[PDB]
Write a protein that binds this ligand. Structure first.
Ligand SMILES: [Cl-]
Length: 261
């Protein structure tokens, strides 16, 4: 039911790409401030003004035929991020050493910010193109840990959770540009006979084989935690309570590091 859970207690099983000789360095770390010196540990990007590209393979490939698929992970931008990504990717069969921005993914999911620009990416590869989510939700611009959870249901509905709470909810067909128009001209009532129905929008075209972090950061220091993937929503949200729902401790740790200032 839970296919995968990266705790980032270690990073040896994650492979860093060879597509460039200058990808940024990463480490296991709890950051400058933390709710717990051990449980707050995670994947930390260390170097300013770098690209990052590292990945790990699912022990077993992941499918979602007539079944739910739930993705969750957290990013902590404690560094005062002005420009940088904090999103992950789910990819079909690929070579981790040539992993880069152009590598074919099925899903690109997570926070991204640069200047006054801010949104949560939910990008689905469908029918040979990457389809950007039509809705634009800004993620919280603070130094605290935030969790991003996505439910892709077998009825082609979806739901996006930020910090455990529902932020967006709707239909894949309506909130992305995946299919042709149902009407030949909108509001005419005349059907478009070329329209093709797809009951498998939610379904991965090929089985999913890797998770990867492919981001650019100007101000580095971000920490990734708890990459969870499964087929049951409550199960994942329960796991988010266990791992993230550290809230009270972290916020107090943040105030402590802010009273000094
Ligand atoms: Cl997007």
């Amino acid at each position: 039911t839970v296919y995968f859970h990266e705790e980032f207690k270690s990073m040896e099983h994650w492979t860093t790409s060879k597509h460039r000789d200058d990808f940024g360095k990463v480490e296991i770390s709890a950051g400058k401030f933390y709710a717990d010196a051990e449980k707050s540990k995670g994947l930390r990007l260390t170097e300013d003004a770098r690209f990052y590209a590292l990945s790990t393979a699912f022990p077993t490939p992941i499918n979602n035929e007539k079944k739910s698929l739930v993705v969750s992970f957290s990013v902590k931008h404690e560094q005062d991020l002005k420009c940088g990504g904090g999103y992950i990717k789910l990819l079909p069969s690929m070579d981790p050493e040539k992993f880069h921005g152009e590598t074919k993914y099925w899903l690109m999911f997570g926070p991204d910010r640069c200047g006054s620009q801010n949104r949560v990416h939910i990008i689905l590869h469908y029918n040979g193109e990457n389809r950007e989510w039509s809705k634009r939700i800004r993620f919280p611009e603070d130094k605290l840990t935030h969790v991003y959870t996505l439910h892709i249901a077998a009825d082609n509905s979806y739901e996006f959770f930020l910090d455990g709470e529902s932020k967006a909810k709707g239909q894949l067909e309506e909130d992305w540009s995946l299919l042709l128009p149902r009407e030949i001209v909108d509001g005419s009532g005349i059907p478009n006979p070329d329209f093709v129905e797809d009951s498998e929008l939610h379904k991965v075209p090929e089985p999913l084989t890797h998770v990867g972090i492919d981001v650019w950061q100007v101000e580095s220091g971000s920490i990734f935690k708890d990459i969870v993937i499964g087929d049951d929503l409550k199960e994942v949200l329960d796991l988010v309570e266990k791992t993230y729902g550290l809230k009270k401790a972290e916020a107090d740790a943040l105030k402590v590091m802010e009273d000094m200032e």
